[PDB]
Structure formats: C-alpha cells, structure tokens
Amino acid sequence: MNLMLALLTNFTLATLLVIIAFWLPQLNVYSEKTSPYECGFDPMGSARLPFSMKFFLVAITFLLFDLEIALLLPLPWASQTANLNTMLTMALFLIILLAVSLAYEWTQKGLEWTE
Amino acid sequence: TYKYVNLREPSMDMKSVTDRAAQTLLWTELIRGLGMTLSYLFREPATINYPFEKGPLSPRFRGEHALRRYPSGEERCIACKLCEAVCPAQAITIEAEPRADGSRRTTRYDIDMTKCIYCGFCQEACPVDAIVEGPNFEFSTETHEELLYNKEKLLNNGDKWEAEIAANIQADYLYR
Amino acid sequence: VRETFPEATIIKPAEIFGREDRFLNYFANIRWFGGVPLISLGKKTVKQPVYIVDVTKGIINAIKDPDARGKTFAFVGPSRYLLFDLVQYVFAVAHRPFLPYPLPHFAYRWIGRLFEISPFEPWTTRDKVERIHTTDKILPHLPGLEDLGVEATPLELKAIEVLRRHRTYRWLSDVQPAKTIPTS
Amino acid sequence: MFMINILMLIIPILLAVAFLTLVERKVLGYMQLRKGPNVVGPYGLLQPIADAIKLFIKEPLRPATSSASMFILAPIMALGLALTMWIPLPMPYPLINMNLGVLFMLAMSSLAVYSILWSGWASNSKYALIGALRAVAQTISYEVTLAIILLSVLLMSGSFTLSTLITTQEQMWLILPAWPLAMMWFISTLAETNRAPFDLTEGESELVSGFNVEYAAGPFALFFMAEYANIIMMNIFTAILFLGTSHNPHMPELYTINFTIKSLLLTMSFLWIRASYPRFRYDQLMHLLWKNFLPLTLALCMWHVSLPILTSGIPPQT
Amino acid sequence: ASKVKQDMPPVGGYGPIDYKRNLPRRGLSGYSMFAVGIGALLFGYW
Amino acid sequence: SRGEYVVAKLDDLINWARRSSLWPMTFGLACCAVEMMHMAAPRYDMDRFGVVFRASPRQSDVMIVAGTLTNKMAPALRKVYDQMPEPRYVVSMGSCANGGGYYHYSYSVVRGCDRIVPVDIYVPGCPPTAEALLYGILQLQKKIKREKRLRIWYRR
Numbered sequence: 001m002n003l004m005l006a007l008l009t010n011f012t013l014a015t016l017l018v019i020i021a022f023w024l025p026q027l028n029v030y031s032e033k034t035s036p037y038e039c040g041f042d043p044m045g046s047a048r049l050p051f052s053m054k055f056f057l058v059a060i061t062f063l064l065f066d067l068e069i070a071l072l073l074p075l076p077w078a079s080q081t082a083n084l085n086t087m088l089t090m091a092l093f094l095i096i097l098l099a100v101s102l103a104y105e106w107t108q109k110g111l112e113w114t115e
Numbered sequence: 116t117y118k119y120v121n122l123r124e125p126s127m128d129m130k131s132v133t134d135r136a137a138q139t140l141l142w143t144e145l146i147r148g149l150g151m152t153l154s155y156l157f158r159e160p161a162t163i164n165y166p167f168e169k170g171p172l173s174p175r176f177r178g179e180h181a182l183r184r185y186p187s188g189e190e191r192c193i194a195c196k197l198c199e200a201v202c203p204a205q206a207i208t209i210e211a212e213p214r215a216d217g218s219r220r221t222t223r224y225d226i227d228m229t230k231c232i233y234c235g236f237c238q239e240a241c242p243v244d245a246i247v248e249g250p251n252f253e254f255s256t257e258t259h260e261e262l263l264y265n266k267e268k269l270l271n272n273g274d275k276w277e278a279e280i281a282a283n284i285q286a287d288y289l290y291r
Numbered sequence: 292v293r294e295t296f297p298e299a300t301i302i303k304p305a306e307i308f309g310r311e312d313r314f315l316n317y318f319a320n321i322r323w324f325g326g327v328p329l330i331s332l333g334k335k336t337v338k339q340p341v342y343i344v345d346v347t348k349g350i351i352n353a354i355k356d357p358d359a360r361g362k363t364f365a366f367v368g369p370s371r372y373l374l375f376d377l378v379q380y381v382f383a384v385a386h387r388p389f390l391p392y393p394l395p396h397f398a399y400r401w402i403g404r405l406f407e408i409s410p411f412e413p414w415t416t417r418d419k420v421e422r423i424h425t426t427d428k429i430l431p432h433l434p435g436l437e438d439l440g441v442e443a444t445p446l447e448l449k450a451i452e453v454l455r456r457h458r459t460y461r462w463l464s465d466v467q468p469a470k471t472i473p474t475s
Numbered sequence: 476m477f478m479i480n481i482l483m484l485i486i487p488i489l490l491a492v493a494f495l496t497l498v499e500r501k502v503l504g505y506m507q508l509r510k511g512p513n514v515v516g517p518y519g520l521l522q523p524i525a526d527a528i529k530l531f532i533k534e535p536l537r538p539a540t541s542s543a544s545m546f547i548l549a550p551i552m553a554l555g556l557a558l559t560m561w562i563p564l565p566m567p568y569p570l571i572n573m574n575l576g577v578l579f580m581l582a583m584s585s586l587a588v589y590s591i592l593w594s595g596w597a598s599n600s601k602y603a604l605i606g607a608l609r610a611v612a613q614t615i616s617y618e619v620t621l622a623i624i625l626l627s628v629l630l631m632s633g634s635f636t637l638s639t640l641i642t643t644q645e646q647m648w649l650i651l652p653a654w655p656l657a658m659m660w661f662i663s664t665l666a667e668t669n670r671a672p673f674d675l676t677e678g679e680s681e682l683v684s685g686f687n688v689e690y691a692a693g694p695f696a697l698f699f700m701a702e703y704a705n706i707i708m709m710n711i712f713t714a715i716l717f718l719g720t721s722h723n724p725h726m727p728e729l730y731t732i733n734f735t736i737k738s739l740l741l742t743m744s745f746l747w748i749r750a751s752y753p754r755f756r757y758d759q760l761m762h763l764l765w766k767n768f769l770p771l772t773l774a775l776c777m778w779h780v781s782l783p784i785l786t787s788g789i790p791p792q793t
Numbered sequence: 794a795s796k797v798k799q800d801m802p803p804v805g806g807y808g809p810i811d812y813k814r815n816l817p818r819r820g821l822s823g824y825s826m827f828a829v830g831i832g833a834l835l836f837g838y839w
Numbered sequence: 840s841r842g843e844y845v846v847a848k849l850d851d852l853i854n855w856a857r858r859s860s861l862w863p864m865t866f867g868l869a870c871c872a873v874e875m876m877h878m879a880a881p882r883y884d885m886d887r888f889g890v891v892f893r894a895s896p897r898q899s900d901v902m903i904v905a906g907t908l909t910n911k912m913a914p915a916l917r918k919v920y921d922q923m924p925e926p927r928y929v930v931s932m933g934s935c936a937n938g939g940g941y942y943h944y945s946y947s948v949v950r951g952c953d954r955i956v957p958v959d960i961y962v963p964g965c966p967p968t969a970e971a972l973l974y975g976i977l978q979l980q981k982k983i984k985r986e987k988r989l990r991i992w993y994r995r
C-alpha cells in the first residue's frame with residue numbers, strides 16, 4: 001500500500017503542475033508563433049531526419065551489454081554458495097566474454113564516429 | 116626574432132612516462148584547474164553596487180548633448196553650421212535668421228539622437244564651445260520620438276548640466 | 292447615431308472572416324467538443340461572410356469619398372452559403388474530422404448559458420448562438436462594396452491563410468469548393 | 476501519518492531544488508569574480524520564488540504540429556520519476572524500506588530516458604530529434620558503467636539493500652577500498668544528468684539544440700525540476716555509497732546533519748566542475764565511456780568479485 | 794615662464810614588468826602518486 | 840477588501856515576479872553586443888539583478904536588439920520575435936537599432952528596428968556604455984512595475 005500511495009502522490013503532483021501550467025497563464029496563439037523554432041530561417045526541406053547507422057549501433061551495443069549485466073546482477077548472492085570455485089570461474093567467464101565483445105567492436109571500427 | 120610555441124620532445128625515460136601515466140589516470144592536471152577556480156571563490160568580486168555606485172569616467176567623456184550659454188545668459192551658438200558640416204552621421208539640422216535684435220542665432224537646432232554616433236566632432240568643430248557632449252549617459256526613453264531633440268531640449272540640458280559641464284571643460288581645455 | 296450625427300456614414304458588414312476573427316476560428320475550436328452541434332443541422336441559415344481586408348478598404352475609401360456622407364452601406368461577400376456547407380468547408384480546409392449532429396434550439400441555448408459563467412472571454416454565449424444561426428439579410432437598396440471601388444474577396448481564396456494554423460501536419464501533400472446558394 | 480511523511484519528503488525536495496538554482500548562480504558567480512543574485516530579497520533569497528512565479532504565468536507555447544499527448548507526458552514522466560527515486564533513500568530511515576532498493580534506483584533511472592525521447596518526438600522539429608537521439612545514446616551508454624560499478628561495490632556490502640551500505644561503512648568509508656570505482660562513478664553521474672562537461676544538449680549552443688528547446692513556461696520548469704532533483708539525488712546516492720555516515724539509533728538527527736553536509740558538498744562539486752572545464756565533443760564522451768571507462772570498469776568488476784574470495788572477506792547475505 | 798608639462802615616464806623609467814609564462818611545478822612524481830593510491834587500496838582491503 | 844484591493848495586490852505579485860526574473864535573448868548583431876557582454880562581466884554583473892546572461896528564445900522575456908539590423912537580417916529578427924512567449928519586451932540598444940545610426944542612409948539597413956518589432960525601451964549611444972544599458976534594463980523593470988493588467992481586467 002505504502003508504495004502505491006507514494007507513486008500515486010508523485011505522479012499526481014506532476015500532473016497537477018502540468019494542468020495549472022497550461023491553464024493559469026494567459027494565452028495568445030497565431031500562425032507565426034506555434035511553429036518550430038528552427039534558427040530564425042524557414043525550413044529548407046519537407047523531409048524527415050535521415051537514418052544514421054552509427055546511432056543505431058550504440059543502441060544495439062547498449063542492449064547486448066545491458067543483457068549481459070542482467071546476468072551479472074545476482075553475483076552478490078552468488079558469492080554465498082559453497083561451490084566458490086565453480087561460481088568464481090563462471091563469474092569471470094561472463095565478464096571476460098563481455099570484454100571480448102567489447103574488443104570485437106573496437107577492432108572492427110564499431111565504436112568510431114567517422115563516416 | 117621568433118620563438119616556438121609548441122615545439123618540444125617529451126622525455127621517454129620511465130620516470131617521465133610514469134608521470135604522464137599518473138596524470139592520465141589520476142586526473143592530476145584537471146584537479147589543478149579546480150584549484151584555480153577555488154581561489155577565485157575566495158577573492159573579492161569586482162562587482163559594483165549600481166545604481167548606488169557608478170563606474171569611473173573622465174572629464175573627456177562624451178554623453179548626452181547640451182547647448183551652453185555665456186555667463187550673461189546669451190546663447191553661445193551663432194548658427195555657423197560647422198557642427199552640421201562635420202557631423203559624420205548628418206544628425207544635426209540647423210536653420211537660422213537674424214534675431215529681433217539683429218544677432219546671428221538659430222531658429223532650429225535638432226540633433227537626431229538616433230542618427231548620432233556620439234563622436235564629439237561637433238564640439239571639436241564648434242568655435243565658441245556652444246555644442247558639447249555632457250557627462251550624462253542615463254537618458255534612455257520609452258519612445259523613438261523622445262530622442263529627436265530640438266533646440267528647447269538642448270538648451271534645457273545645458274541649463275541642467277552647466278554646473279558639471281563647465282567643470283569638465285575647465286579640466287580638459289588645456290589639452291585641446 | 293443617424294440622428295445625433297446626420298452626416299455620419301454607417302457600414303453594415305456581414306460576419307467578417309480573417310486571421311483574428313471569431314467566425315472561422317469559431318467553427319474550428321468546436322473540435323474540442325467532439326462533433327459539431329448545428330441547430331436544424333445548419334440547413335435553415337444562410338451566411339454571406341465578408342473578408343476583413345475588403346471591409347477595411349471600404350472604410351478607408353469611405354473617408355476619401357465625398358459621396359459617402361450621410362449614407363448607409365452593407366459590406367457583404369460575393370457568395371452565399373448554408374451554415375452546414377460553410378462549416379463543412381472549414382473542417383475540410385482545416386483537415387479535421389467532421390461529425391455534425393443536430394441539437395434543438397432550447398438545448399443549444401442551455402449550453403450557451405453554461406459557458407457564460409466564465410469571468411473571461413466566454414467560448415460561446417446565448418447571443419453568439421443566435422447570431423451564428425441568424426440568416427444574413429439581403430438589402431438590395433443599400434450600396435455595397437462595389438460603390439466604394441472594392442471587389443469582394445471570395446472566402447475560398449482567403450480561407451487557407453485563416454485555417455492553416457488549425458491543421459496538425461506541415462506539408463500534408465485538394466478540398467473542393469463549398470456549395471453556394473445561387474442568386475435569385 | 477504516512478501521507479504526512481510523503482509530503483515531508485516531496486515538498487522539501489522541491490524547495491531544495493529551488494534554492495540549488497540560487498546557490499549555483501552564486502557559486503558560479505563568485506568563481507567568476509562576481510556576486511550573482513543579491514537584489515531580489517536578502518542575498519538573493521527570493522530569486523527562486525520570482526523565477527517560479529514568472530515561469531508559471533507565461534504562455535506555455537506548444538507548436539500546433541506537435542503531438543500533444545507526448546508533449547504533456549514527457550514532463551510528467553520526468554518529474555514523476557525524479558521524485559520516485561527519493562523514496563528508498565536511507566536518510567537514515569527510508570520512507571519505503573526496500574530489500575532491493577539499489578536495483579529500484581537503477582530501474583527507475585533507466586525509465587527517465589523516455590522523457591528525453593518523447594519530448595524529441597513531440598517537437599516534430601528535427602532540430603531536436605537529433606538532440607534527443609544524441610542525448611539518449613549518451614544516457615544509456617553511461618548507465619552501463621553505473622550498473623557495473625554499483626555491482627562491484629555491492630560485492631563488499633552483500634546485498635542490494637540501501638541501509639546495508641551504512642553497516643558496511645561502519646568502520647571506514649568505501650572510498651578508500653574503492654577510490655578507482657568512485658572516480659568513474661562520479662563522472663558517470665555527471666554524464667547521466669547531462670551536466671558539464673557532458674552537456675552537449677541542454678546548453679551546448681554549438682550548432683546543436685537541446686531536446687527541450689521547444690518547451691516554455693511551466694512545462695519547461697517541470698523539466699528543470701526533474702533535472703535538478705536528479706542532481707541532488709545522484710549526489711545523495713554517492714554520499715551513501717562511498718562516504719557512509721555513522722548511524723546512532725538514539726540520535727538519528729546526527730546522521731541527517733552529517734549526511735546532509737556531505738551531499739551538499741558533493742552537489743557543490745557539480746557546480747565547481749561546471750565552472751572549471753570546457754565540454755567534451757560528443758564523439759569524445761562516447762570514447763570516454765566505451766574505450767576508457769568500460770575496460771577499466773570490467774577489470775575492476777573481475778577484481779572485486781575475486782577479492783573477497785581470496786581475502787576471506789565475503790560480506791553476509793543479510 | 795612655466796615649463797612644459799605633459800604625461801611622461803618618471804626619472805629612470807618604470808620598474809620591470811614580467812611577461813614570460815609562469816606555470817610552477819607542483820605535486821609529487823608518478824611513482825609516489827601510485828604508491829599512495831595502492832597503499833590506500835591495501836589499507837582499505839584489509 | 841472592495842475587490843479592487845485583492846486585484847491590486849495580485850498585480851504587484853506578478854509585476855514583481857516578472858521584473859525580478861527578466862530573461863533576455865540578446866541579438867548580438869554588431870559592436871553593441873560587446874558593450875552588452877561587458878554588462879554581463881563582473882563589474883556590472885547583470886545576473887545579480889535576476890537577468891541571466893543568455894536564454895533561448897522559447898524561455899526569453901525580453902529581446903535586446905544590439906547592433907545594426909540589415910534588410911537581410913530583418914526577416915530573421917521578426918521570426919525570433921514572433922516565437923517569443925508573452926509577455927515579451929524589446930530593448931533597442933544603440934543608434935543603429937534605434938534609428939539607423941551611422942548607416943541610416945544605406946541601401947541595406949533597416950532605419951530602426953521599431954519598423955520590424957515594437958520597442959519598449961530605447962537606449963541611446965554608439966555604443967551605450969555597459970552602465971547605460973543596465974540603466975535601460977532597470978528602466979524596463981520600473982515599466983513592468985507600472986502594469987495594471989488585472990486592475991484593467993477587473994473593470995472590464
């Protein structure tokens with residue numbers, strides 16, 4: 001219960017501030033306003049942002065690394081086992097393969113930003 | 116004679132290589148940059164308490180314009196139109212005619228304070244110290260029309276700042 | 292006014308449409324309330340809106356025209372529309388969904404009575420509902436914008452500029468002209 | 476009485492954030508040889524209040540071609556998560572005493588990246604979508620080192636309970652045994668919060684706009700509160716993690732005073748760093764994470780898994 | 794018969810003015826810094 | 840009470856808030872931007888009045904037009920002004936922005952930025968001293984302190 005009340009209070013307060021942030025102020029809208037800021041000059045093209053492959057690889061690299069961290073999270077509880085030798089070997093095997101994954105992207109120019 | 120700014124060969128003895136490794140790993144020279152800003156936090160700031168304190172100026176300061184008088188109260192200007200000829204921005208407009216007593220005096224004397232570049236050439240050109248730039252620099256307006264001065268405004272500035280304009284001219288005319 | 296100032300010029304415009312108007316902008320913010328309520332489904336009302344710049348050039352020409360002293364004008368647009376087919380056009384130009392549904396006169400005034408409680412600019416009022424549905428009078432015996440040297444601007448030409456801000460996409464990619472009641 | 480407890484947490488946080496804007500402008504002011512706000516109230520004490528009222532009575536511009544649902548969701552998500560992360564903090568007693576408090580902090584922190592992504596989408600600008608993508612790639616990269624670093628420290632504490640880090644440091648701060656980890660943790664909490672020298676979006680002003688450049692008035696204020704609420708929380712997390720304060724059950728206020736001082740100093744260290752350095756180029760702060768921090772973090776994770784085992788110093792599970 | 798008086802340097806000129814770069818050496822060597830760092834770790838591990 | 844009392848005090852509250860948190864967007868166009876940077880410098884430290892060094896257009900309250908406004912730049916200055924949320928104020932700094940200045944009779948110069956945008960305060964000089972600009976900002980605070988938005992609304 002105590003947790004649900006806390007989350008409800010935190011997110012209800014945020015919603016309240018947003019509504020009074022849109023209704024309290026005095027508004028005046030016209031076409032010149034309510035347009036993308038740009039930089040003071042008109043848009044130079046009616047096309048969406050080109051897809052950049054490098055930005056896609058960092059998201060995937062984070063995902064695969066983030067999945068290997070999920071396996072490393074239970075280490076604090078794993079160190080309490082009686083089979084420490086087996087546990088230690090598998091703990092180091094996982095981290096080493098994580099480093100081998102880093103070494104592959106590094107040497108294959110996967111971490112660069114020069115096109 | 117020339118000097119090189121970035122022509123050095125770093126030493127490659129283990130003592131020096133380990134120093135650079137310590138700097139790379141222990142962030143030594145970055146923390147040295149934190150000590151330079153920590154020192155400033157414990158200095159006296161250079162801020163002044165404007166408007167109660169004001170920045171220093173000199174007698175030569177070129178501020179708001181003013182038309183001056185002789186000690187008798189007669190206007191100094193004799194409508195010679197030298198200030199109008201020299202004005203690099205063409206901010207001065209003058210019309211004149213003989214006065215009721217026959218003297219050579221202006222009927223129009225306008226300075227467009229929005230064309231003026233506050234250069235001082237008008238007070239250099241003036242042969243009778245009539246047009247001067249005073250020490251006031253705090254005359255911002257709420258409209259563009261308040262900054263088109265005519266002869267009445269300029270004579271009011273002179274009668275308003277004579278006590279201070281006269282003192283400044285007394286302190287600088289020997290350099291002119 | 293005609294008695295206090297006999298030489299006065301009196302201009303009688305229809306609903307004026309423009310960027311800052313409350314006529315076309317009024318038939319675009321009703322999207323906030325789902326469908327579009329129209330008394331009698333907006334079929335018994337005829338509107339002849341006029342353009343703001345046309346009304347403005349009429350007033351200016353009336354100042355320089357010596358023949359306008361003590362004269363009454365009627366500034367009207369070139370075309371007549373049904374309130375339903377004009378409101379449909381606004382949504383078509385604004386590219387917003389159009390869900391009209393009728394509502395009785397007594398109920399439309401009730402909701403207008405509700406919006407009048409606002410201590411700020413009411414979104415709508417009882418008087419506003421009466422004027423939106425009042426049919427625009429025809430006064431053939433009064434000079435129009437042609438007697439002041441002004442050519443009325445069709446609502447079709449100047450509707451896009453008024454209703455552009457209400458669209459939700461930039462560079463969407465057309466709409467057909469609204470049905471007009473023929474003269475006579 | 477628990478609902479009183481929640482308000483006794485939320486409201487002071489929103490006041491601490493308010494007066495962190497004053498201290499930031501005065502610490503930066505004096506480190507730049509000037510004074511900072513000292514006119515609006517004594518020593519500027521009313522400046523945060525004036526800024527708050529000003530922002531909330533200004534037009535909240537929302538471009539007509541902006542997805543309204545996401546334009547409103549992003550500030551709600553950001554602030555809602557910013558306040559949520561404060562509930563498990565042992566100062567010294569948590570509002571909600573979680574057995575997995577540390578993992579809760581990571582889980583909620585990784586959700587906050589959406590507000591950056593949703594705000595960029597809702598702009599329909601493409602001067603901000605690139606900013607959002609750059610900001611998001613930065614944030615997810617640096618929560619990889621936060622998780623692995625935090626995992627390494629927990630191998631000397633024993634559990635994910637936030638209160639257990641108090642017991643672990645009852646003899647000595649964890650900064651001595653883990654100063655290599657603390658250094659990278661501090662930098663990683665600077666990059667997560669988009670704080671200088673890692674502010675490529677918020678205030679770069681180098682041919683790169685911020686993901687919230689399109690926000691104005693109150694909605695902008697809400698993003699600002701979330702950003703500053705996170706700066707204090709991350710620095711409070713660092714104090715608990717590496718600078719543990721002794722806890723006397725009979726004088727709990729002694730803990731709160733000492734722990735409050737350490738958190739302030741760490742927070743003022745954020746302000747100190749902003750005044751001292753230029754900002755990383757975007758491709759440089761990725762090389763910092765992937766080529767420098769990540770290799771060292773992995774090695775220190777191997778070292779901190781085997782160090783307790785080889786020294787017979789494995790912490791208790793409870 | 795007053796003498797000419799204008800802004801001039803004092804008799805003998807002004808004092809010397811420093812202009813060359815001055816960045817003093819500070820801190821310890823790399824060996825000592827690593828020794829303190831590792832020593833801190835060893836005490837902490839113990 | 841009287842109603843007019845509550846509205847009068849609410850005006851002071853919102854007038855005080857708006858003049859104590861003036862966030863300017865500076866259009867540094869020509870030399871007058873340098874004197875604007877000296878007002879942010881330690882001696883005058885505009886930040887101590889609540890006036891931040893720089894703000895983005897979407898969070899700016901006042902536009903300082905500091906420098907010559909050419910025809911080429913005129914469309915871009917209006918676009919930034921239109922995108923400033925209200926209330927918005929414009930301070931014209933220097934002769935060039937005030938009325939054209941040294942380049943008044945040029946083929947490529949807007950003879951005063953008041954042709955493109957409304958102006959609330961005109962600061963004269965070429966350039967105005969950093970102190971004369973700070974006097975204009977302080978003179979804009981007093982103008983905002985005289986606003987009666989709510990008193991007028993209450994009497995509509």
Ligand code: SF4
Binds near residue numbers: 202206232
């Ligand atoms: S100061 Fe220069 S520009 Fe101004 S009026 Fe005098 S001569 Fe003309």
Ligand code: SF4
Binds near residue numbers: 193199237244
């Ligand atoms: S002010 Fe001086 S220079 Fe100008 S017309 Fe008068 S006397 Fe001549």
Ligand code: SF4
Binds near residue numbers: 871906932966967
């Ligand atoms: S008014 Fe003077 S200082 Fe300012 S831009 Fe023009 S010439 Fe330069």
